[model samples]
Target: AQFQCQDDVKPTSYTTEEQKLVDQFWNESLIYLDQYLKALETPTGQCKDSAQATIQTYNSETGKMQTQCIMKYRDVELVAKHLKAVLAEPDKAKACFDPQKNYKAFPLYTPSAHVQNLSATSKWINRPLLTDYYKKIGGEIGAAGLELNENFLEITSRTDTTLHWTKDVSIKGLPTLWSSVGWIPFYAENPNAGSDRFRGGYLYAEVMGPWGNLRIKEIDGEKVGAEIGMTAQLFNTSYPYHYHHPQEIYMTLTKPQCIDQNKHMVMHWDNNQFKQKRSDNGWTVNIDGSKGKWKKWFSNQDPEQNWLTYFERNAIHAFHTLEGCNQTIKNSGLVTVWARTTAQDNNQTTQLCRPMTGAKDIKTMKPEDKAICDLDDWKP
Candidate 1:
């Protein structure tokens, strides 16, 4: 090491034994650290990253090196582990080092909207639009809406299972080109039915991509694999989609356990602020939290790349389905949705579905009838 530390400064020279130790440390670190560093060079890697990682084996008396006394093998290894995990994503680092954190796999993103409206051209497959397969864009369903935490919406599904809709919601603060929407879902009680073994739910998010294409992500707990749900053939073949996991996020199959242990799980997307100017890459999303913001790998393909006009509407839809022995929802109000003009603006709206007072069970509810949705209670 003959290079100067500065323009006129001479570099410190290590003794022969010390040099050998330094070489050993460097080689050892390269074994695991090289691949990790290489990932950052790829397109999906962080656009900008800087890490000064140093390794030392901590042999002091044997080598008689003062520097080795302070920097132990454990200390060097700890830094290497942190840098590797953090580069994967922040939540990933915690999940790796901290066993009790209870991490959920990044929420799965997949498919579309059959927008239901009163317009002459809008499809009205179901009469009342609230029941009888009324799974259309922005239409009412069994699940009740809770509070809108500004840009975050809360929802709960107990009596009835599914709720979803599609419509453009403006995302103001970050940039006008990017649209924003999100849902927070939770359930705490055990199944009311005696036949139920365990209670479970799923979340569906869809966005129309470049060139009038539709993209969907369907996330279900119970360790199900991701799937390709919607397709429109504008590209001759289904536009490609990608799914990423920080890695094996495990959960127990025990009954009465809520998703995220009954804690609020938030999912949303847009430009994500990583870009100096918007590219065909479009945007990325962080499903469970803001820790892992993944890019839309399939966005803005050669001829299909158009971020300015991706989807007709920016939408966030929450749908829940119960499986196992429990046939009915044990409680009410399991989910909510939120909206905000900007990240900085506080004057945002809360869209809560006001459940009707004294409503009948979903079994007796009729289509078009307030049915499960109590209109008077709606805080729209």
Candidate 2:
């Protein structure tokens, strides 16, 4: 079934009260930072107990204000220390808030306290499966000399091509036994793992299954193959407008409410007419067609709600989080288990495409390149 764009989708504007609360949250954070810095200079820990900030957010369901600790007292020192360093370096300070630049220098903060609180309050139905899979896959990837992080799993070894597969295991909540295999070229010139301007864990794993033969019939008669793994964006970060050859699907697994209301957006156009512009935020697209304009959709904030989104191959899209990362009442950031797939013509290889924009060096862009781009057209 084709995904329908909601006609009511539009840009979000915070309510007056919400804007006030947002401003207050930032002010409180600055105060906390100042207090923590002052304490570092003195022997006595004056701000030890005062390092927390109470953040207020509007609860749409109850029509009331909800208060939560944006930062726990324990994390105050760490954040304060990081901020101090960022402030000391002018270049770091300039790029600190910009998600696209210098990820290692200014790593995204995952709120441990909030994530812990969420686990205590609610249980994911697929938690058992996810935990098991991660543990098994972690071992497999480690043995293969690949690196695994919270946001991504990378195949870094030159000789590593085969991903060891676990036998189809029965999941407690699911009907089918989960079975799949991951593939990548044997150290082609491109490095398959790293961060870029638009995303973290920006690597591709060609995946296939013996479980079923579900395929995109319109694209090709070949069986399904995809880049199956997690893609994450920290709170307050946004991925620029881009497109890929594979049909894409994203399934929300963590606390859904932790994500900003407008998590994803899309625009469609003819491939030949596509043009891109780079902005301070990221890349924006201009194309010809009725559906050329970007449209925001899937603005859901219910903590219990899980979402699955689909995008057709070559459809221009982007992800955004306008709400700052300080709202640590839910999950750390937006995470989705994604599958990007197109037809696989042969058992030995699948169509491997890199993301691209209408840039001059599109041909030479590597998987590890730090630029705005999308997947090229699907080749049969």
Candidate 3:
């Protein structure tokens, strides 16, 4: 390394061994870490992602990575229409991820009028308009709304499996052109059905990016994912969205088992170490508490780097559509997952359907529903 910004200063050395370690770390990470996400899948139960990911050892027979992931998207109006067309059948649903321009992808499902009217305030986010946008933009069938976390384990959990990941909720992927309109707590949860998975659970969260950046991070744990009837529920109906580059974050996770096992998992995100992301996938944010952040990959400019967040949303969205646009690889670039496994209890398969947000709350309608929603006769 050479050269410095100041006149009296000159640069010096390179760290090859450390860089190689980062490379290896990122390689394995792309595999196991990426599996944590739910992807559009076939009725046969396979993620609709383009290729089998590369992990541990290359398994050419079953593709690369074998995973079925589910994502909670509150960008309802943005996903509704296509959900209609795709849900028409399973094969068609998988078409959403097609590379051909002839097909549609993204916003896999659209929210019902009741869904749109249901969104909270953000003067710029006209629920009525988003509803209209869906009529035009559309989503493929697939899945939408909410489903308990246990529903996931019944389908995806491994026997005695342990996945250590954090959650994040925000409006980053939302229509930035109209961003000022929402502080919506955007996320999903699906926990197991049996035990009190979140009891005495420790959830950590924060946000980073430029001032007035309008992006923030939301992370939480619920009965979802590891328990029956577990699902990602909306928390903090209204939270501000502000972000900045090199978003440095630190967190400690303590699950009931974490205490019994006697260990702690820490994470740093959106720090100086992060650089640009790949172009084909969405960025990663839920690893070891990395919601809306990055890990590994040091900047040669700063060897002892701790954290960083690169990628301007606009530029990110553009270049990220290339051959390898994976969320996990893009966000942290490299990660090491070391968290306890939430118990696997799936007793809610019979309970999964559409518009999961209101499944448990349908028994009552708020007195202010009429005032908050755009239309009067709204029902999901």
TM-score of every prediction relative to native: 0.17, 0.33, 0.17
Residue 212, candidate 2: C-alpha displacement in angstroms: 15
lDDT (10s digit) by residue, model 2, range 6-29 = 122222355685445323323332
List per-prediction Cα lDDT, in the order shown: 0.19, 0.31, 0.19
Query: What is the Cα-based TM-score of model 2?
Result: 0.33
Candidate 2 minimal-lDDT segment of 10 residues: 156-165
How many Å off is the CA of 37 in candidate 1? Answer: 16
Off by over 4 Å in 3: 1-14, 36-200, 203-380
lDDT of 1 at 47: 20
* Cα lDDT for residue 86, candidate 2: 30
**lDDT score at residue 202, model 3, on the 0-100 scale:** 12
Residue 29 shift from truth in candidate 2, angstroms? 43
Identify the leading candidate in terms of lDDT.
2
List candidate 2 segments past 4 Å from native: 1-222, 258-262, 270-306, 322-331, 343-380
Residue 353 C-alpha lDDT in model 3: 14
Each prediction's total of clashing residue pairs, residues at least 3 apart in sequence or on different chains, is 34, 5, 75
Alpha carbon lDDT at 108, candidate 2: 23
